[PDB]
Amino acid sequence: VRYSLDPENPTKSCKSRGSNLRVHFKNTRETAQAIKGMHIRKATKYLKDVTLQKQCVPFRRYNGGVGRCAQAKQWGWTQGRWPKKSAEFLLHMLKNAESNAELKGLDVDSLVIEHIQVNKAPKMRRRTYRAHGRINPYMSSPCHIEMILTEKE
Amino acid sequence: SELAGHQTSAESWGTGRAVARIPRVRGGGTHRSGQGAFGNMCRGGRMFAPTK
Amino acid sequence: SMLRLQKRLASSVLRCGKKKVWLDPNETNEIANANSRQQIRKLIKDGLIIRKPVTVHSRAR
Amino acid sequence: SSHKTFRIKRFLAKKQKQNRPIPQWIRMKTGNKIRYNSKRRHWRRTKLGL
Amino acid sequence: GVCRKAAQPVEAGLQIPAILGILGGILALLILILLLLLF
Amino acid sequence: TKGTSSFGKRRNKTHTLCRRCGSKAYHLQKSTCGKCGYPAKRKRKYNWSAKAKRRNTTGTGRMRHLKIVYRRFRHGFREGTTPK
RNA sequence: AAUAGGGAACGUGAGCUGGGUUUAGACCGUCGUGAGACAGGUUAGUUUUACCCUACUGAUGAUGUGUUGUUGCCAUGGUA
RNA sequence: AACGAGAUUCCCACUGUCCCUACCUACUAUCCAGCGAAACCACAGCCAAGGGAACGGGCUUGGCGGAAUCAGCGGGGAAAG
RNA sequence: GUGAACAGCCUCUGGCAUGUUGGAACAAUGUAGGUAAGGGAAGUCGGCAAGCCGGAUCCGUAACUUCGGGAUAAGGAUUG
RNA sequence: GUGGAGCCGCCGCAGGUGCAGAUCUUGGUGGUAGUAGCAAAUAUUCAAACGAGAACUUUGAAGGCCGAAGUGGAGAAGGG
RNA sequence: GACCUGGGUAUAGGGGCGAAAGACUAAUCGAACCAUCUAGUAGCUGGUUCCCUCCGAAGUUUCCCUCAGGAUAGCUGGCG
RNA sequence: AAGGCUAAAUACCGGCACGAGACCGAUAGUCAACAAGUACCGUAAGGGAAAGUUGAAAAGAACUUUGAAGAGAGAGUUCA
Numbered sequence: 019v020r021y022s023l024d025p026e027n028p029t030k031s032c033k034s035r036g037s038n039l040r041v042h043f044k045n046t047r048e049t050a051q052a053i054k055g056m057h058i059r060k061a062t063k064y065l066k067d068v069t070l071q072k073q074c075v076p077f078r079r080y081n082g083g084v085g086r087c088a089q090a091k092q093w094g095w096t097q098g099r100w101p102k103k104s105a106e107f108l109l110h111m112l113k114n115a116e117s118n119a120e121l122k123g124l125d126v127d128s129l130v131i132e133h134i135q136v137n138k139a140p141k142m143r144r145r146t147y148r149a150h151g152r153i154n155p156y157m158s159s160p161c162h163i164e165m166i167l168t169e170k171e
Numbered sequence: 172s173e174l175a176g177h178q179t180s181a182e183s184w185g186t187g188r189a190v191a192r193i194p195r196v197r198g199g200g201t202h203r204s205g206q207g208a209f210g211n212m213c214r215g216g217r218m219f220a221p222t223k
Numbered sequence: 224s225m226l227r228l229q230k231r232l233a234s235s236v237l238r239c240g241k242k243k244v245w246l247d248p249n250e251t252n253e254i255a256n257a258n259s260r261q262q263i264r265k266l267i268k269d270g271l272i273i274r275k276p277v278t279v280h281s282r283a284r
Numbered sequence: 285s286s287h288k289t290f291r292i293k294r295f296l297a298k299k300q301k302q303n304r305p306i307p308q309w310i311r312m313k314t315g316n317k318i319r320y321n322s323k324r325r326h327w328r329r330t331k332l333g334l
Numbered sequence: 335g336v337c338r339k340a341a342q343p344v345e346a347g348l349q350i351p352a353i354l355g356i357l358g359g360i361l362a363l364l365i366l367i368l369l370l371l372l373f
Numbered sequence: 374t375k376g377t378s379s380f381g382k383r384r385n386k387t388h389t390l391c392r393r394c395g396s397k398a399y400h401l402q403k404s405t406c407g408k409c410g411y412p413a414k415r416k417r418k419y420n421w422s423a424k425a426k427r428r429n430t431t432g433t434g435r436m437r438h439l440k441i442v443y444r445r446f447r448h449g450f451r452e453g454t455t456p457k
Numbered sequence: 458a459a460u461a462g463g464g465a466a467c468g469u470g471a472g473c474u475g476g477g478u479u480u481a482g483a484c485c486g487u488c489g490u491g492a493g494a495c496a497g498g499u500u501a502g503u504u505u506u507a508c509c510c511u512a513c514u515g516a517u518g519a520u521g522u523g524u525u526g527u528u529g530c531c532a533u534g535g536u537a
Numbered sequence: 538a539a540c541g542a543g544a545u546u547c548c549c550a551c552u553g554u555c556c557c558u559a560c561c562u563a564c565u566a567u568c569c570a571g572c573g574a575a576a577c578c579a580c581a582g583c584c585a586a587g588g589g590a591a592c593g594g595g596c597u598u599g600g601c602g603g604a605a606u607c608a609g610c611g612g613g614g615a616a617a618g
Numbered sequence: 619g620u621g622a623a624c625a626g627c628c629u630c631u632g633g634c635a636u637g638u639u640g641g642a643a644c645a646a647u648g649u650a651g652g653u654a655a656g657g658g659a660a661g662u663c664g665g666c667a668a669g670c671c672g673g674a675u676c677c678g679u680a681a682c683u684u685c686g687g688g689a690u691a692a693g694g695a696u697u698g
Numbered sequence: 699g700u701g702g703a704g705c706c707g708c709c710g711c712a713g714g715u716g717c718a719g720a721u722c723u724u725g726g727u728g729g730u731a732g733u734a735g736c737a738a739a740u741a742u743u744c745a746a747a748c749g750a751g752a753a754c755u756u757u758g759a760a761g762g763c764c765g766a767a768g769u770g771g772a773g774a775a776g777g778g
Numbered sequence: 779g780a781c782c783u784g785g786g787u788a789u790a791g792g793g794g795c796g797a798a799a800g801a802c803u804a805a806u807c808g809a810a811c812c813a814u815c816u817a818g819u820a821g822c823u824g825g826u827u828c829c830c831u832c833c834g835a836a837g838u839u840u841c842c843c844u845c846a847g848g849a850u851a852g853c854u855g856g857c858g
Numbered sequence: 859a860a861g862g863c864u865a866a867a868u869a870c871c872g873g874c875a876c877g878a879g880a881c882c883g884a885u886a887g888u889c890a891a892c893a894a895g896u897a898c899c900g901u902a903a904g905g906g907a908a909a910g911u912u913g914a915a916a917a918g919a920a921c922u923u924u925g926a927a928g929a930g931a932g933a934g935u936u937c938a
């Protein structure tokens with residue numbers, strides 16, 4: 019398919035993709051800000067400590083009602099949350115971002131995450147049950163992702 | 172459209188519940204449950220002065 | 224490896240309730256094999272599903 | 285009911301056979317556009333009325 | 335099978351809880367708070 | 374008790390499915406039918422519901438013996454065998 | 458010591474309470490042929506939602522000073 | 538007389554109704570993990586006086602004003618239904 | 619089993635995972651359950667709420683009365 | 699720049715001929731918002747297995763609950 | 779005990795039924811629901827889609843079961 | 859007059875076939891261009907939708923890698 023901003027160093031920069039993966043959008047977007055521009059083997063070591071609640075992920079845009087925590091002072095912010103499902107999937111395919119990279123003959127120990135974006139998926143539906151005999155929808159909000167991994171030289 | 176465009180049987184809500192006083196269809200069930208009935212405004216409705 | 228079928232089939236051939244049946248978890252891939260009723264009666268004869276008798280309700284006091 | 289007359293269980297035999305998935309090859313055929321059976325009556329969702 | 339749950343069933347239904355979700359909300363004069371305003 | 378706890382006493386059916394029309398309308402207490410009026414001789418159709426004719430006119434069934442009239446008529450009801 | 462008078466959408470119902478008024482039940486009196494009427498009387502009578510912004514009360518904070526910490530001064534604002 | 542989930546007054550005993558509040562437990566609320574709606578919505582949201590459709594948030598003239606926020610809160614939005 | 623008892627409480631036979639989820643901490647505010655010295659309705663439209671008495675035995679019983687009732691009246695004493 | 703098979707000017711003729719509103723109609727999507735919420739009926743815990751993966755499955759051992767007007771064993775009606 | 783309850787049957791819209799509240803009659807009752815006559819009538823609210831250029835007012839008379847409206851004149855425009 | 863018959867010119871929005879249209883072009887046209895009086899609701903009378911388009915051709919992505927799979931990366935098909 020076609021990405022956004024196909025790479026300027028096209029032989030020596032790798033790329034991956036995942037579509038219609040059931041995570042929240044507002045928790046997959048805001049774990050993607052926190053690793054944007056980070057070296058991969060530190061970013062892989064980052065997302066493990068998110069799920070083990072050692073090193074949080076700050077919420078900068080979608081900060082409605084999010085309770086404070088102390089680990090967010092590293093990122094200059096007061097609110098944080100530890101997504102152990104959202105930082106699972108894009109841990110699970112930074113595995114599959116570099117599994118393509120050395121398949122193209124690239125030294126993976128110099129990769130940094132250049133580009134990453136999250137964009138929503140068609141919201142699949144099921145229904146709730148409310149008062150006075152009314153129905154409202156439980157709408158899941160899944161999301162696509164997209165990423166470019168670039169060696170620095 | 173000669174005369175028939177009115178083979179959908181309906182009535183107005185008749186009270187200020189929170190919708191317009193346009194005729195709404197009856198029943199339940201299908202997606203044509205409380206939609207707009209005849210009148211020139213509405214989807215699936217009659218036309219203004221249907222030609223003769 | 225479900226054993227819910229053996230839990231049901233034993234408590235109609237031992238004439239007992241579903242609770243009281245069954246000790247011995249060591250031959251688990253042996254008692255999961257037999258899903259019949261005639262092949263489940265060998266496991267009583269081999270002593271792998273036992274009766275495990277009734278809880279005590281002494282009328283001493 | 286389990287006390288049913290004959291003209292019910294030869295009606296229930298008809299609403300049990302026609303509640304069935306499609307064979308897969310007819311989706312491949314020429315000149316159709318159907319891709320899933322939509323008349324599948326699910327026994328808790330949608331009920332018959334006798 | 336392989337594609338009997340993943341390519342037969344994924345078109346079968348997948349919009350069947352949207353049997354509208356409601357028929358209108360016929361809640362029938364919920365101004366039960368009798369108010370009567372000073373007469 | 375007027376509402377949802379009254380629906381729990383809905384247990385015995387009233388309209389079983391009829392024998393001629395086949396429409397779930399055979400009223401069992403009164404031994405008649407809704408759409409066709411079964412113990413009557415004539416078929417209950419009316420003009421006030423102009424669609425209910427359209428559900429059950431000639432042409433909405435199979436027309437098993439008027440696929441045979443509307444084809445034999447256009448040759449004039451021949452009765453002989455054929456020529457070889 | 459004094460038991461001063463007042464206002465703030467007749468301060469104050471997503472603060473409460475329902476006693477009276479002011480629905481539908483009912484009784485008496487007077488008026489009316491009658492249905493019913495009665496600032497005449499009595500008894501019985503469902504009180505909805507704050508998660509939005511603001512105000513406020515608390516709580517991390519933010520900028521500017523090179524990073525950072527300790528000890529401090531006080532413009533102001535409150536007031537017994 | 539009896540009887541009454543009937544209505545009213547007093548007395549005895551009693552008590553947190555109160556003087557005057559305090560403490561303890563459970564389930565919440567709170568925070569994290571996962572799933573995640575609706576109500577409502579011109580644009581939005583600091584105040585005083587003035588005039589004005591005679592009681593503004595937005596105009597006039599003044600007083601003044603910092604990001605993004607959480608737990609509450611029931612004065613206002615002549616709030617919402 | 620206890621007890622007059624198919625009352626409540628507990629256990630075996632026979633069932634299930636606490637009712638469409640858990641982990642951590644134990645603020646306000648509620649929700650449900652309690653206790654409180656001294657006073658005892660002063661609260662409030664109102665003794666509403668909560669409390670008090672509650673089973674058995676032996677005593678003991680008034681006004682009134684249609685002579686059946688009031689009545690388990692009230693007021694006590696005992697209870698392992 | 700996409701697009702892949704039809705279109706426009708001029709003289710005349712004919713219109714279901716032009717949208718910001720109608721608590722418009724159908725359809726779509728936010729803001730609220732990762733917020734409210736997942737709180738009626740006491741309660742789970744340890745090891746092993748199958749497994750890519752276990753607070754929620756199975757199996758055990760223990761702790762419990764319903765407690766014979768049952769959270770048990772069976773039917774009518776209804777469900778098919 | 780003027781007691782409670784299952785199934786069968788009867789009574790149908792100006793009609794059923796009522797130990798009487800205008801309750802009940804499929805969440806609908808001071809007259810049920812479904813379809814048509816019917817797109818029922820409305821002196822009454824809500825709306826009524828392109829641009830420029832020229833001219834540009836009226837709330838008064840008389841009469842009306844007229845006072846939220848219409849007729850008549852007045853005032854306006856277009857055509858000569 | 860108190861008995862009777864009768865083709866033609868004439869009416870047709872149901873029926874079998876047809877032909878044409880200064881029409882409508884998928885929220886239009888009938889409700890229905892498709893498995894529409896179908897899915898669905900209502901005890902019943904009855905109410906009743908949504909939904910047309912790959913390409914010229916299926917030539918519908920063989921094969922290799924990662925992951926349990928969804929899904930990616932290469933390769934390929936096609937002018938695309």
Ligand SMILES: O=C(c1ccc(-n2nnc3cccnc32)cc1)N(c1ncccc1Cl)[C@@H]1CCCNC1
Pocket residue numbers: 364365366367503505618
């Ligand atoms: O449930 C309700 C109830 C309460 C409010 C609404 N309202 N009011 N405005 C509304 C706008 C939208 C939606 N609902 C609305 C509806 C119902 N009750 C109730 N309470 C008091 C009076 C009348 C009732 Cl019916 C029951 C009755 C018995 C006690 N338990 C609760």
Ligand SMILES: [Mg+2]
Pocket residue numbers: 531
């Ligand atoms: Mg100072």
Ligand SMILES: [Mg+2]
Pocket residue numbers: 884885
């Ligand atoms: Mg469309």
Ligand SMILES: [Zn+2]
Pocket residue numbers: 391392393394395396398406407408409410411
């Ligand atoms: Zn019939």
